Write a protein that binds this ligand. Structure first.
Ligand SMILES: *[C@@H]1O[C@H](CO)[C@@H](O[C@@H]2O[C@H](CO)[C@@H](O[C@@H]3O[C@H](CO[C@H]4O[C@H](CO[C@H]5O[C@H](CO)[C@@H](O)[C@H](O)[C@@H]5O)[C@@H](O)[C@H](O[C@H]5O[C@H](CO)[C@@H](O)[C@H](O)[C@@H]5O)[C@@H]4O)[C@@H](O)[C@H](O[C@H]4O[C@H](CO)[C@@H](O)[C@H](O)[C@@H]4O)[C@@H]3O)[C@H](O)[C@H]2NC(C)=O)[C@H](O)[C@H]1NC(C)=O
Ligand SMILES: *[C@@H]1O[C@H](CO)[C@@H](O[C@@H]2O[C@H](CO)[C@@H](O[C@@H]3O[C@H](CO[C@H]4O[C@H](CO)[C@@H](O)[C@H](O[C@H]5O[C@H](CO)[C@@H](O)[C@H](O)[C@@H]5O)[C@@H]4O)[C@@H](O)[C@H](O[C@H]4O[C@H](CO)[C@@H](O)[C@H](O)[C@@H]4O)[C@@H]3O)[C@H](O)[C@H]2NC(C)=O)[C@H](O)[C@H]1NC(C)=O
Ligand SMILES: *[C@@H]1O[C@H](CO)[C@@H](O[C@@H]2O[C@H](CO)[C@@H](O[C@@H]3O[C@H](CO[C@H]4O[C@H](CO)[C@@H](O)[C@H](O)[C@@H]4O)[C@@H](O)[C@H](O[C@H]4O[C@H](CO)[C@@H](O)[C@H](O)[C@@H]4O)[C@@H]3O)[C@H](O)[C@H]2NC(C)=O)[C@H](O)[C@H]1NC(C)=O
Ligand SMILES: *[C@@H]1O[C@H](CO)[C@@H](O[C@@H]2O[C@H](CO)[C@@H](O[C@@H]3O[C@H](CO)[C@@H](O)[C@H](O[C@H]4O[C@H](CO)[C@@H](O)[C@H](O)[C@@H]4O)[C@@H]3O)[C@H](O)[C@H]2NC(C)=O)[C@H](O)[C@H]1NC(C)=O
Ligand SMILES: *[C@@H]1O[C@H](CO)[C@@H](O[C@@H]2O[C@H](CO)[C@@H](O[C@@H]3O[C@H](CO)[C@@H](O)[C@H](O)[C@@H]3O)[C@H](O)[C@H]2NC(C)=O)[C@H](O)[C@H]1NC(C)=O
Ligand SMILES: *[C@@H]1O[C@H](CO)[C@@H](O)[C@H](O[C@@H]2O[C@H](CO)[C@@H](O)[C@H](O)[C@H]2NC(C)=O)[C@H]1NC(C)=O
Ligand SMILES: *[C@@H]1O[C@H](CO)[C@@H](O[C@@H]2O[C@H](CO)[C@@H](O)[C@H](O)[C@H]2NC(C)=O)[C@H](O)[C@H]1NC(C)=O
Ligand SMILES: *[C@@H]1O[C@H](CO)[C@@H](O[C@@H]2O[C@H](CO)[C@@H](O)[C@H](O)[C@H]2NC(C)=O)[C@H](O)[C@H]1NC(C)=O
Ligand SMILES: *[C@@H]1O[C@H](CO)[C@@H](O)[C@H](O)[C@H]1NC(C)=O
Ligand SMILES: *[C@@H]1O[C@H](CO)[C@@H](O)[C@H](O)[C@H]1NC(C)=O
Ligand SMILES: *[C@@H]1O[C@H](CO)[C@@H](O)[C@H](O)[C@H]1NC(C)=O
Ligand SMILES: *[C@@H]1O[C@H](CO)[C@@H](O)[C@H](O)[C@H]1NC(C)=O
Ligand SMILES: *[C@@H]1O[C@H](CO)[C@@H](O)[C@H](O)[C@H]1NC(C)=O
Ligand SMILES: *[C@@H]1O[C@H](CO)[C@@H](O)[C@H](O)[C@H]1NC(C)=O
Ligand SMILES: *[C@@H]1O[C@H](CO)[C@@H](O)[C@H](O)[C@H]1NC(C)=O
Ligand SMILES: *[C@@H]1O[C@H](CO)[C@@H](O)[C@H](O)[C@H]1NC(C)=O
Ligand SMILES: *[C@@H]1O[C@H](CO)[C@@H](O)[C@H](O)[C@H]1NC(C)=O
Lengths: 271, 213, 240, 134, 95, 134
């Protein structure tokens, strides 16, 4: 396995500093949309990778230099019920909510996210123009797993909406208090995320309150197509394909097979 | 350069030739590597022999080298017209740089000589607006590297404003040169005919112009 | 397949400085030493020094220990075996003895007894150390001359005259004509002027089917002269 | 100099020839222990490490049908062809990598294996049988 | 003057796609969660990750034509199904 | 003459001896690619191509314990027995096939392997150790 090592890497091209390993570096299998979680940090600069930047339909993978802190909570001090079904099975049901109720949410510090956007916008201008304006609104529409930042934590599957993060236009020097930015988040227990549409999974309830912190390391964006050259470009969030969640961790790795049989001329004689 | 070579070397067509390269015991060939450079003066040179008699890739085996205890030698079999240029030798070690020699001009004779092409041009009307006059005597396609040019105003010699170039090798393995004559509009008007004479070693080419024509 | 390219021609004054580039292509820039050797008519050629783009190790001549500074960029890999690096060289304290054509070349081997030896040379870069001024040329056409009366061949060209700085390259019909193009070297006047000529042997029947325009491109003065040679001949051996 | 596994991938072929036993010792035995009995995920990695020795013994078979058989440097009796790599000695072994060498031979490499399996041991062995009775 | 000579063990690689392994990370026995994602079958990590830099090497990479992503994609899906296979079905809940 | 794989199955043993490297190169690597992950049908063919190298290395082991070790023609120091194939030379190698030869030796072949694994390297090696110190 050949491992690229230079700090700045296009993803496509020759890596001038290559090392080799058998086992790779630790990768956490994280199922997440719109936001890459617990991922590997970039080196010194924010990377904007794409299979084809000019083609709009191809997604734009982003890797962060500084991790964006995020805190998600399921505040409902919940309980469970083990009702007996069948000779051996046992179904776990969501009991009555003990205590007060309010919606699950995720907190992202506004200063860190403002700085992260102000740092990504400059890396995006290198492909789309120095001293030009770019915008990004919320999702367009469609599947719930595509339009929402879907992930897992503790057992519950949070489907948060990131519309509160993507309202921005950018001047060449600035943008156009509030200690934190909160995000409304709904929860789902039955998931048809399986590409085999013959099965679905029921998430068992988690007895107690849920709070989980995480690093935000990546993004998945789509550009609005059309004749928007003289005007501004728009980077709405997206996702769907799970393979895009892995390319931000396997970009520096390639598999090669060894062919140790070589022929070369030297002067020597047998018998 | 304490690395001394042969003074000046000539040769014949399709024969062998030997070039020397030696120096004191400090830059001796006893324990140092010797290399040879084909050097077209003013163009891209070429490495032909490196570190010893071993030649550079692509070099025809017509070239060869030898290293004694007091001198190094370059041997060239089957002399060709394109081999007529100056060569250099270098002495070095694995870590030290190059030390060039004195130089050795090579002239392969026995070839077909070339009848020269000498053309005389006068100044145009725009130079008559510039209040100057320059006669242009162009020389090309002559084999021996020696020409003598004389400027004659009304068949009378001129010494001031007379400038003549040096022989230059044509890429077609011939030679080329030129000579100019600077004159004033008063000296341009007060004469009948102008002559540029080029005395070859076996001929003489003269061209005559006139301000009235 | 290493096709190296050096810098362009520039003019400077004595005591000043000039910087010459050496851009590479087609080969690994970090695998070979980069040699630098001059050619001056006052002392012949002299090895100036080599440098290692990989290990950063240079080695100059003790005479060039103070005035020569050689730099290299990092290679830009094009393929797994091709890179496009660059090697610059700054020379200061310009004197009259430092006038000539300069060269950069590729090292020989990556290991052995002769590793840095120059193999692939650049096209060269001519420098003239002079306190004189940059003066543009005066370009004239040349009248056609007969070369073979029975064959029917004419000879026409263009005349570049009286330029002090570096010489000039000339194309014909925007480089569309290379057959018969024969260019003469420059002159050396008592005042320090340089002047040359160029010519082409054209068919005498090629007077109503083709047009011949010479293109002069003086770069240190940043001038261009495009001249049209008149097809009207003047030699009595060609009028027949 | 060692520099570990594949350390001389960009060095000269003469310097990389000084690290043959390092590249060999780490290609055959990358031993994973499969004492745990996990049903469907073993057949993919076990097929991988079975095709590993199938590819290994294919090279040993080619390294057996030739007069060369020691798992080391070895010489043959087939002459080098000037059409293959029109280069002299020490131009290769001191300014070339094994990758760039295999690249230039890739045009002409397929016939060299045939010239080593027929021009020798179809005749060298036959000559050994017809020259040992005396 | 010169003859062909074979050399067994030269650093020559050609890019290809084959089946890869997976690592246990070595803390798996002290997790004791009965089954994590791939703690089921993966083998422990080597005591020292053999990371060897290859000097003078420029290798052309392409993350978008990579086959390692297709393997981890097909490993995660087969990981989901084999994890949910022996668990409790809830088809009588469709009431 | 070549005639491809197994082309000399009915020719003379001397003519078939001219096609040893052809029968060898095609028995070890009949490489099928098993990149597709199909559950139960791989274990039958993978077991087949694992027993293939188990049978292959059993021959290499017998071709290793004997003084013969080059994967070629090879000579030993065990004399031929007149009880085995009461025939002169050139009656075999010019009027017999390898199949008919193995058929007539099948009665006496089982002891020849023992005469090649004990009468030699249990003693030849022991003599090599007791004759190399000088
Ligand atoms: C990756 O690729 C690169 C580029 O392709 C490649 O770099 C080349 O590596 C080879 C060897 O692997 C080099 O070739 C060798 O060069 C040796 C260097 O010379 C010796 O002396 C140096 C001192 O100079 C003296 O004079 C100067 C004058 O200015 C003075 O200042 C000094 O004080 C001193 O008196 C000395 O610096 C050098 O020392 C070592 O450490 C330096 C630290 O900077 C390092 O830069 C050097 O490279 C070196 O490691 C050294 O002692 C030369 O001796 C050597 O000769 C050997 O082989 C010959 C065979 O004939 C033997 O006869 C001889 O005894 C030696 O054993 C050999 O020529 C080459 O110069 C590199 N550069 C290139 C081509 O660009 C890397 O190696 C590649 N790496 C890998 C892993 O693949
Ligand atoms: C998407 O993008 C949108 C737009 O970019 C973002 O939505 C906007 O959010 C902001 C912040 O909440 C909304 O701002 C409003 O702020 C007013 C308070 O400020 C006004 O009143 C002050 C006194 O009450 C006054 O001081 C202010 O300034 C005046 O006076 C100063 C004195 O010097 C003077 O200098 C100024 O010139 C002014 O004269 C100012 O007038 C607040 O009242 C708003 O909330 C109330 O009203 C709204 C609508 O009326 C209602 O919806 C609320 O429920 C509430 O009743 C509001 O906070 C701004 O209105 C938002 N824009 C829109 C279109 O709604 C958004 O945050 C991004 N993300 C998301 C998730 O949408
Ligand atoms: C990205 O990475 C972050 C890491 O920062 C992950 O966040 C962690 O997620 C795990 C799993 O949800 C959390 O671990 C859970 O903590 C619960 C609370 O335990 C408290 O008390 C213990 C004991 O002192 C403390 O160690 C702990 O910090 C808490 O104070 C436990 O109840 C959970 O129990 C689980 O494991 C036990 C093991 O026996 C089982 O018995 C249970 O059934 C249950 O499975 C669990 O241990 C952890 O607190 C989170 N925070 C961290 C480490 O910072 C994210 O989940 C990860 N992924 C994403 C998508 O964000
Ligand atoms: C991106 O951001 C835009 C806003 O910039 C956002 O568009 C808004 O979406 C909300 C829903 O999330 C819309 O609100 C609905 O509007 C319809 C009418 O258009 C109402 O009928 C809805 O109320 C119904 O449901 C309620 C639930 O209890 C009932 O109580 C009620 O009686 C109705 O049945 C609801 O108000 C809103 O209209 C739009 N438009 C704007 C500009 O606000 C968009 O959803 C975000 N996301 C995406 C994917 O684009
Ligand atoms: C995220 O970063 C941007 C860019 O730094 C912040 O924009 C800044 O916002 C403040 C207050 O909203 C602006 O100050 C005010 O500007 C108005 C302009 O009319 C002026 O009238 C007021 O008196 C006051 O000065 C500031 O100009 C603006 N730009 C910069 C460069 O600071 C934005 O506030 C940040 N969001 C946060 C911190 O939550
Ligand atoms: C050495 O390099 C020279 C110059 O490139 C090259 O000509 C040699 O190849 C062959 O040398 C033979 C010497 O007898 C010659 O007869 C043969 O024509 C020539 N082959 C070609 C294609 O020119 C190189 N020799 C070796 C040994 O590599
Ligand atoms: C990163 O890779 C892209 C790949 O598209 C580079 O863009 C060029 O893309 C064309 C095909 O459309 C290739 O033929 C070129 O070779 C690519 N250029 C180069 C220099 O590789 C893009 O230039 C690369 N670099 C950056 C900074 O985006
Ligand atoms: C997410 O939660 C962590 C831990 O609860 C927060 O970190 C604390 O932040 C406060 C305020 O700056 C500090 O006083 C504490 O010392 C921090 N604790 C630790 C362990 O670092 C973090 O600020 C929260 N982030 C958001 C966006 O809410
Ligand atoms: C990207 O897509 C555009 C539009 O189809 C195309 O012109 C361009 O060549 C593509 N580039 C790549 C690298 O695929
Ligand atoms: C455009 O390029 C300039 C110089 O490279 C840089 O300073 C500037 O930041 C770039 N554009 C913007 C607005 O970031
Ligand atoms: C950004 O600030 C710089 C420096 O003050 C200024 O020159 C430039 O015009 C500003 N650009 C914008 C869009 O305000
Ligand atoms: C987030 O990144 C910081 C920076 O190294 C690290 O200390 C912290 O452990 C990370 N947290 C997670 C959950 O990866
Ligand atoms: C090695 O160097 C020689 C001379 O510098 C050159 O001719 C040859 O092409 C080089 N090798 C390669 C593979 O480029
Ligand atoms: C070299 O190869 C050519 C073409 O493959 C062949 O015709 C020629 O006989 C070969 N020469 C030698 C000496 O092998
Ligand atoms: C290799 O063979 C291909 C087959 O067409 C040919 O096109 C190519 O030019 C060959 N390359 C060399 C270097 O001979
Ligand atoms: C031949 O075989 C017979 C019976 O197997 C045995 O008695 C006899 O000694 C053998 N002779 C030789 C020369 O091996
Ligand atoms: C081979 O051995 C069997 C064992 O009984 C015997 O019957 C048979 O006659 C033998 N054949 C020959 C040809 O010796």
């Amino acid at each position: 396995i050949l491992k690229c090592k230079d700090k700045k890497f296009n993803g496509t091209g020759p890596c001038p500093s290559v090392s080799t390993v058998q086992c790779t570096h630790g990768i956490k299998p994280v199922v997440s949309t719109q936001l890459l979680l617990n991922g590997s940090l970039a080196e010194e600069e924010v990377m904007i990778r794409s299979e084809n930047i000019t083609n709009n339909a191809k997604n734009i993978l982003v890797q962060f230099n500084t991790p964006v802190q995020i805190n998600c909570t399921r505040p409902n001090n919940n309980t469970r019920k083990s009702i007996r079904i069948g000779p051996g099975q046992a179904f776990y049901a969501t009991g009555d909510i003990i205590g007060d109720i309010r919606q699950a949410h995720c907190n992202v510090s506004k200063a860190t996210w403002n700085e992260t956007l102000g740092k990504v916008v400059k890396q995006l201008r290198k492909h789309f123009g120095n001293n030009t304006i770019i915008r990004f609104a919320n999702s367009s529409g469609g599947d719930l797993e595509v339009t929402t930042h879907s992930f897992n934590c503790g057992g519950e599957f949070f489907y948060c909406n990131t519309s509160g993060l993507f309202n921005s236009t950018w001047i060449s020097n600035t943008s156009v208090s509030n200690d934190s930015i909160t995000l409304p988040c709904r929860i789902k227990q039955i998931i048809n995320m399986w590409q085999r549409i013959g099965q679905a999974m029921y998430a068992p309830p988690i007895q107690g309150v849920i709070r989980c912190v995480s690093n935000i390391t990546g993004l998945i964006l789509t550009r609005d197509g059309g004749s928007t050259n003289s005007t501004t470009e728009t980077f709405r969030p997206g996702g769907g394909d799970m393979r895009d969640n892995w390319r931000s961790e396997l970009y520096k790795y390639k598999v090669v097979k060894i062919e140790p049989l070589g022929v070369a001329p030297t002067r020597c004689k047998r018998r | 350069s304490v690395l001394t070579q042969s003074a000046s070397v000539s040769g014949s067509l399709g024969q062998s030739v030997t070039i020397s390269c030696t120096g004191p015991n400090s830059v001796c060939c006893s324990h140092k590597s010797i290399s040879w450079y084909q050097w077209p003066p003013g163009r891209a040179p070429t490495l032909i022999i490196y570190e010893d008699n071993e030649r550079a890739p692509g070099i025809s085996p017509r070239f060869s080298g030898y290293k004694s205890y007091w001198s190094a030698y370059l041997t060239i079999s089957d002399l060709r017209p394109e081999d007529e240029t100056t060569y250099y030798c270098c002495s070095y070690t694995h870590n030290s740089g190059c030390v060039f020699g004195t130089g050795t001009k090579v002239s392969v004779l026995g070839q077909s000589k070339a009848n020269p092409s000498v053309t005389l041009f006068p100044p145009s009307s725009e130079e008559l607006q510039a209040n100057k006059a320059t006669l242009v005597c162009l020389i090309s396609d002559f084999y021996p590297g020696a020409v003598t040019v004389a400027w004659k105003a009304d068949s009378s010699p001129v010494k001031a404003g007379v400038e003549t170039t040096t022989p230059s090798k044509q890429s077609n393995n011939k030679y080329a040169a030129s000579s100019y004559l600077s004159l004033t509009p008063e000296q341009w008007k007060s004469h009948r005919s102008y002559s540029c004479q080029v005395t070859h070693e076996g001929s003489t080419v003269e061209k005559t112009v006139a301000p009235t024509e | 397949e290493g096709q190296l390219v050096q810098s362009g021609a520039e003019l400077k004054k004595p005591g000043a400085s000039v910087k010459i580039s050496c851009k590479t292509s087609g080969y690994r820039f970090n695998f070979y030493h980069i040699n630098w050797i001059r050619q001056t008519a006052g002392r012949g050629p002299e090895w100036m020094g080599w440098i290692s783009p990989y290990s950063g190790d240079k080695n100059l001549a003790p005479a060039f220990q103070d005035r020569v500074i050689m730099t290299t960029d990092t290679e830009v890999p094009v393929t797994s075996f091709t890179s496009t690096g660059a090697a610059y060289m700054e020379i200061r304290n310009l004197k009259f003895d430092d006038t000539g054509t300069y060269f950069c070349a590729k090292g020989l081997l990556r290991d052995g007894s002769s590793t840095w030896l120059p193999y692939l040379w650049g096209q060269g870069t001519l420098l003239t150390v002079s306190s004189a001024s940059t003066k543009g040329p005066s370009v004239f056409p040349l009248a056609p001359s007969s070369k073979s009366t029975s064959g029917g061949t004419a000879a026409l060209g263009c005349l570049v005259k009286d330029y002090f700085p570096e010489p000039v390259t000339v194309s014909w019909n925007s480089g569309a004509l290379t057959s018969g193009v024969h260019t003469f070297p420059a002159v050396l006047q008592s005042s320090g002027l340089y002047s040359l000529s160029s010519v082409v042997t054209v068919p005498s029947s090629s007077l109503g089917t083709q047009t011949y325009i010479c293109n002069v491109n003086h770069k240190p003065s940043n001038t261009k002269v495009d001249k049209r040679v008149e097809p009207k001949s003047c030699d009595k051996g060609l009028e027949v | 100099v060692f520099l570990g596994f594949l350390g001389a991938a960009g060095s000269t072929m003469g310097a990389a020839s000084m690290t043959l036993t390092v590249q060999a010792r780490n290609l055959l035995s990358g031993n994973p222990d499969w004492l745990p009995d996990m049903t469907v995920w073993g057949i993919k990695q076990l097929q991988a490490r079975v095709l590993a020795v199938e590819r290994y013994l294919r090279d040993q078979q080619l390294l057996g049908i030739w007069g060369c058989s020691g798992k080391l440097i070895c010489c043959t009796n087939v002459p080098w062809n000037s059409s293959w790599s029109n280069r002299n000695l020490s131009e290769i072994w001191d300014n070339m990598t094994w990758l760039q060498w295999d690249k230039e031979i890739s045009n002409y490499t397929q016939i060299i294996y045939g010239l080593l399996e027929e021009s020798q041991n179809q005749q060298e062995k036959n000559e050994q049988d017809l020259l040992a009775l005396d | 003057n010169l003859w062909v000579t074979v050399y067994y063990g030269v650093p020559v690689w050609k890019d290809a796609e084959t089946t890869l392994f997976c690592a246990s990370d070595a803390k798996a026995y002290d997790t004791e969660k009965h089954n994590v994602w791939a703690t089921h079958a993966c083998v422990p990590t080597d005591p020292n990750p053999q990371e060897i830099h290859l000097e003078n090497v420029t290798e052309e990479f392409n993350m978008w034509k990579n086959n390692m992503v297709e393997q981890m994609h097909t490993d995660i899906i087969s990981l989901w199904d084999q994890s949910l296979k022996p668990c409790v079905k809830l088809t009588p809940l469709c009431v």
